Design an enzyme around this catalytic site. Structure first.
Site, mmCIF file in Angstrom:
data_model
loop_
_atom_site.group_PDB
_atom_site.id
_atom_site.type_symbol
_atom_site.label_atom_id
_atom_site.label_comp_id
_atom_site.label_asym_id
_atom_site.label_seq_id
_atom_site.Cartn_x
_atom_site.Cartn_y
_atom_site.Cartn_z
ATOM 1 N N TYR A 40 32.202 49.394 29.635
ATOM 2 C CA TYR A 40 30.799 48.980 29.476
ATOM 3 C C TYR A 40 29.905 50.128 29.024
ATOM 4 C CZ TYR A 40 32.961 45.485 32.592
ATOM 5 O OH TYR A 40 33.785 44.547 33.161
ATOM 6 N N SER A 113 35.183 47.155 40.031
ATOM 7 C CA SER A 113 35.718 45.998 39.293
ATOM 8 C C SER A 113 36.636 46.434 38.166
ATOM 9 C CB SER A 113 34.561 45.112 38.844
ATOM 10 O OG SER A 113 33.741 44.771 39.949
ATOM 11 N N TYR A 114 36.309 46.258 36.877
ATOM 12 C CA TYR A 114 37.278 46.725 35.859
ATOM 13 C C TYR A 114 37.513 48.230 36.004
ATOM 14 C CZ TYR A 114 39.519 46.395 31.129
ATOM 15 O OH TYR A 114 40.400 46.350 30.054
ATOM 16 N N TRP A 162 32.673 36.432 31.818
ATOM 17 C CA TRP A 162 33.021 37.803 31.455
ATOM 18 C C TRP A 162 33.224 37.946 29.947
ATOM 19 C CZ3 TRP A 162 37.421 40.654 29.710
ATOM 20 C CH2 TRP A 162 37.314 42.037 29.902
ATOM 21 N N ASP A 255 32.865 38.432 47.067
ATOM 22 C CA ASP A 255 33.218 38.995 45.770
ATOM 23 C C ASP A 255 34.486 38.328 45.220
ATOM 24 O OD1 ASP A 255 34.984 41.385 44.416
ATOM 25 O OD2 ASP A 255 32.819 41.486 43.886
ATOM 26 N N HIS A 283 29.567 39.567 43.675
ATOM 27 C CA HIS A 283 29.713 40.538 42.597
ATOM 28 C C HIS A 283 28.375 40.980 42.038
ATOM 29 C CE1 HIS A 283 30.805 41.886 38.535
ATOM 30 N NE2 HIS A 283 30.056 40.900 38.080
#
Length: 570
Positions: A40, A113-114, A162, A255, A283
């Site tokens: 990101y 997360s990622y 997403w 989450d 989240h």
């Protein structure tokens, strides 16, 4: 004091170069290093850091931090495809860092997360210099979270939400805009403003916009509903038991990754120093405040405490400070209901009593005004509750572990769907003493269908004296996957099956005045895609070709349907 160097280009084994930013302390000689792998935009630190740590403190305390653009995004070269390149790219990156003059041979990772999944992907590389990881809101099994689930249903809002967000980034990071970028952008926002609407198109697999911008949406995720070799290739979970890497694992009860975050703790805790922290967050909402449920200001994501804990953890494993985690518990949970943080020595809690609560009741359990009960005693009369599940009218998702569709209200009041005939409700009597439920949760139901495939869902709910019916945890089973996610088989109409529903985990004290309730149904949309009740390739079916199903829950002495609650008595 420190310095920052931007867009240092790091070559991968295939000669593709990834861009990194280097935050390095103004020091005498080499330093311990922390790496973050981010799709990101490494430059955009404010976007994710508030969900993590005040990590410039690390830099001020003498750690270097490296933030990298993953392959094919923003300043990095190559082509972006989710997950498939992150093990190799992490391994080459770690190798590069270790080669640098400023690295003292000790590397750690952190992120959410990622940015947490990428840490598991790094950890399996066998690079000695990786001394510790801190994966937050993460998973080591991408089928099980976030894209499908332990029950075999597609997490369609997760996928479309997403994908739309990743698409937006591309357009927005464009070097020389394209004529269609403006309208693609508009169109992506329309998906994000109505994810349920986007997920309602049939065939689901026809995604003109997302399929164009990110073919992986269909080619990998939608077209592989079984947990097959394609998923196995990127799964890390089976390799975690062989590792010996300390891991500081964070999760949130609401989450999307929680089931899988918790499972990673259980997988690594025996072989190295693992730590667990679980708050009541979803989240997109780490505030502790929700529309009908407030957990208190102490439930707000405690970013400075997290920073302190991370520093101590890295001091112990990267700097060799043997007593740095003195006084830190192994496990720290936000216990809902009493709404307090509590230390624990393990996850699952020692002394958890896995207790069946049986489905019962006079008459039909349909709707919240039906007669369904929950009891620690088996029901005396054989009975059954029946409803029609129509894919055209699924039960809407409300709270739980939604990620992008109304993903900011985990502990949602369930009264808006209580009047539905296809929501079966079972409740205890009003409680006179508190009951603590902390651990993994599952159901075992005896079920039958008119259809050769269907889904069954179960949701645990805290009913408050004022009427609010607050969601805790929930799960689904897609019946073709009742015994395995890999090798599905159909069912026979009218035959009774005993199936398990994995309802992830929670920590809640049901206080005196409250009731424990379970909702049973056959849909939860768009948290999960809808079963077509055909036995067919669900994402390729048109709505017209789907079937309604008459589904039934069996309960009594010979079919003792129940929920298994992890009861803590202290």
């Amino acid at each position: 004091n420190y310095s920052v160097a931007s867009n240092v280009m790091v070559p991968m084994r295939d000669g593709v170069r990834l861009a990194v930013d280097l935050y390095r302390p103004d020091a005498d000689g080499p330093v311990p290093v922390l790496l973050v792998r981010n799709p990101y935009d490494k430059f955009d630190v404010f976007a994710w850091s508030t969900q993590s740590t005040n990590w410039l403190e690390f830099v001020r305390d003498g750690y270097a931090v490296v933030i990298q653009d993953t392959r094919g995004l923003f300043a990095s070269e190559g082509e972006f495809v989710p997950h498939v390149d992150d093990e190799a790219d992490a391994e080459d990156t770690l190798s590069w860092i270790l080669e640098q003059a400023w690295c003292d041979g000790n590397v750690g990772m952190f992120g959410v997360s990622y940015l947490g999944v990428t840490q598991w992907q790094a950890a399996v590389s066998g690079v000695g210099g990786l001394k510790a990881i801190a994966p937050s809101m993460a998973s080591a099994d991408l089928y099980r979270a976030p894209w499908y689930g332990p029950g075999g249903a597609l997490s369609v809002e997760a996928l479309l939400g997403w994908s739309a967000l990743i698409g937006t980034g591309l357009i927005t990071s464009r070097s020389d805009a394209r004529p269609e970028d403006a309208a693609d952008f508009v169109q992506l926002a329309a998906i994000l403003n109505d994810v349920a609407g986007a997920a309602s198109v049939t065939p689901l697999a026809e995604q003109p916009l997302l399929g164009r911008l990110i073919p992986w949406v269909i080619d990998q995720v939608v077209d592989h509903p079984d947990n097959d070799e394609s998923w196995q290739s990127i799964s890390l979970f089976e390799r975690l038991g062989g590792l010996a890497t300390p891991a500081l694992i964070t999760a949130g009860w609401y989450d999307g990754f929680v089931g899988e975050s918790l499972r990673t703790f259980v997988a690594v805790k025996d072989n190295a120093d693992a730590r667990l922290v679980v708050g009541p967050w979803s989240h997109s909402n780490l505030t502790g405040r929700n529309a009908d449920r407030k957990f208190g200001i102490a439930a707000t994501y405690p970013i400075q405490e997290a920073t302190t804990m991370h520093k101590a953890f890295f001091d112990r494993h990267l700097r060799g400070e043997t007593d740095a985690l003195a006084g830190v518990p192994k496990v720290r949970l936000f216990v809902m209901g009493i709404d307090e943080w509590r230390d624990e020595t393990d996850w699952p809690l020692p002394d958890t009593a896995y207790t069946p609560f049986y489905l019962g009741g006079s008459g039909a359990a349909n709707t919240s005004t039906g007669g369904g009960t929950l009891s620690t005693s088996i029901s005396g009369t054989e009975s059954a509750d029946t409803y029609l599940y129509d894919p055209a009218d699924p039960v809407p998702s409300l709270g739980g572990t939604l990620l992008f569709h109304n993903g900011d209200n985990g502990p949602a009041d369930q009264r808006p769907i209580h009047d539905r005939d296809d929501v079966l409700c079972y409740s205890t009597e009003v409680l006179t003493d508190p009951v603590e439920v902390t651990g993994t949760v599952s159901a075992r139901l005896f079920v039958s269908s008119s259809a050769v495939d269907t889904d069954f869902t179960a949701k645990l709910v805290d009913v408050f004296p004022d009427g609010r019916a607050i969601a805790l945890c929930d799960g689904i089973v897609r019946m073709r996957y009742r015994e395995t996610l890999v090798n599905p088989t159909l069912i026979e109409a009218g035959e009774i099956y005993e199936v398990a529903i994995d309802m992830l985990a929670t920590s809640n004290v049901f206080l005196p005045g409250h009731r424990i309730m379970v909702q049973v149904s056959s849909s939860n949309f768009p948290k999960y895609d809808r079963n077509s009740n055909t036995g067919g390739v669900i994402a390729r079916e048109q709505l017209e070709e789907m079937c309604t199903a008459v589904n039934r829950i069996h309960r009594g002495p010979e079919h003792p349907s129940h929920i298994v609650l992890p009861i803590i008595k202290r």
